[model samples]
Target: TETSQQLQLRVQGKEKHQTLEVSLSRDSPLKTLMSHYEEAMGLSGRKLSFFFDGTKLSGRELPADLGMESGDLIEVWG
Candidate 1:
């Protein structure tokens, strides 16, 4: 059965102080997830980085595939 696993990430832009909540499908690739945020906020992909549990995630890293759990805070910043 296909479960609806989602990741709720906190997005922080250099220009913005308030963190934005970004929900991404668990099955989605890290690249695609990042793209979703860019499209939604009219941001450039090069303007941000992904961070999970205080550790920054590289573009090649997997946010969901690595078994991300609920209540985990994902941070995105420039």
Candidate 2:
């Protein structure tokens, strides 16, 4: 049987010490994670960047692709 793993991530924004918890499938694209924060922070049309595990993340990458696991922290800047 095929199974999906859930990822528990901590996303931290550059301003005001904003932080949020995002739960999603490990195979989900990085864009999906970015969109969640963009919508939550109402940051439409704004340029944003993501970093995890000492490397910048691309929209095409997935959590599993980046070797990210549960309780990982992602930093965001805009």
Candidate 3:
């Protein structure tokens, strides 16, 4: 059986912003997960930044090959 994992995330937008617990496949890419989040929260795809474990994960910081883990807090600041 496949195990499900959830991550706590916060989406900040211009007008609508909220926090949610999102479930993703264990092997999902961090960028893909963020895309899902952007759709779910009705966020734009402009200047989106990623942060995990109090560390900023971005093209300016890390490469685009980063992945997500279980029980991680992924925050999106736009």
Candidate 4:
């Protein structure tokens, strides 16, 4: 069964606007997802603007905070 506490967010970012947000818990801050992207790309310390449903997000935000659902697509920008 699908758990309400989990979310599989899609992060889209490449080239100039370059983003893997993946299976993550809704209770935790978004810091890990952001860090995962940057860390994998060697973009450590680089800041990226996370957008969900066309709205901006912060590293301190959580999926539950925004009522974000699974399969959500997020846009990223610098």
Candidate 5:
């Protein structure tokens, strides 16, 4: 469908990490988000996590799955 709206989400982390605002489609995969985060933090080869809770983010996870909306924060960690 061409009627879907983009989700305005922000990636938040520790004080050492910079906040990154990312827009993604509600139906799109989350690999793009992860990739950008990795690039932002020199986390290459290290296990990067994406979630508001403890561990495990699936490849198919989307903004809708996590109830993300405009100005929502998605926590990230090493």
Candidate 6:
């Protein structure tokens, strides 16, 4: 049996200062994270942006690629 590595990410919705904790694979792409937020926020047809450690995230980038660790905070804007 194999276990996947997971990290806890703190997502902050800038507009309302709402925060959510999500558990995701360390190798997951930013798009996956955005999709979760979109579903939770009931957002559609609107572009969402993400930032971490003051750096804007690219959809194609993975958490591991960005040096993300557990308890890291990501700001989301729609």
Candidate 3 per-residue lDDT over residues 1-78, each given as its tens digit: 224354333434333445655665444455656676667756655546667666776433221234444444566665
TM-scores of the candidates in the order shown: 0.60, 0.84, 0.54, 0.76, 0.70, 0.82
Identify the candidate with maximal lDDT: 2
- The whole-model lDDT of each prediction reads 0.63, 0.81, 0.52, 0.74, 0.71, 0.78
lDDT (Cα) of model 1: 0.63
Candidate 3: residue 70 Cα off by (Å): 3.8
Off by over 4 Å in 4: 14-21
- Candidate 2 residues lying further than 4 Å off, grouped into runs, are 1-4
**Candidate ordering by lDDT (highest first):** 2, 6, 4, 5, 1, 3
Q: Across residues 1-78, which tens digit of lDDT does each residue of candidate 6 receive? A: 134397788888776567777876778887888778777867755767889888888878888888888777889876
- Quick one: best TM-score, which candidate? 2
Candidate order (TM-score) = 2, 6, 4, 5, 1, 3
User: Per-residue alpha-carbon lDDT of model 5 for 1-78, expressed as tens digits?
Assistant: 234498777777765446788777788867777787777768766756777556356657877786667767777765
Over 1-78, each residue of candidate 4 has an lDDT whose tens digit, in order, gives 167767888777744445465766888877778777677778788767777777677778887787778888877776
Model 6: what TM-score? Answer: 0.82
lDDT winner, 3 or 6? 6
User: How much is 62 displaced in model 5, in angstroms?
Assistant: 1.3
lDDT of 3: 0.52
- Give per-residue CA lDDT, model 2, range 3-56, as digits (tens): 447788888977657888898578788889888887887887685898887688
lDDT digits (tens) for residues 1-78 of candidate 1: 125467765555555563566666677666666677677777764557777666666655665665665445566766
* Candidate 5 ranges beyond 4 A from true positions: 1-4, 41-44, 53-55
lDDT of 2: 0.81
The clash tally of candidate 3 reads 0
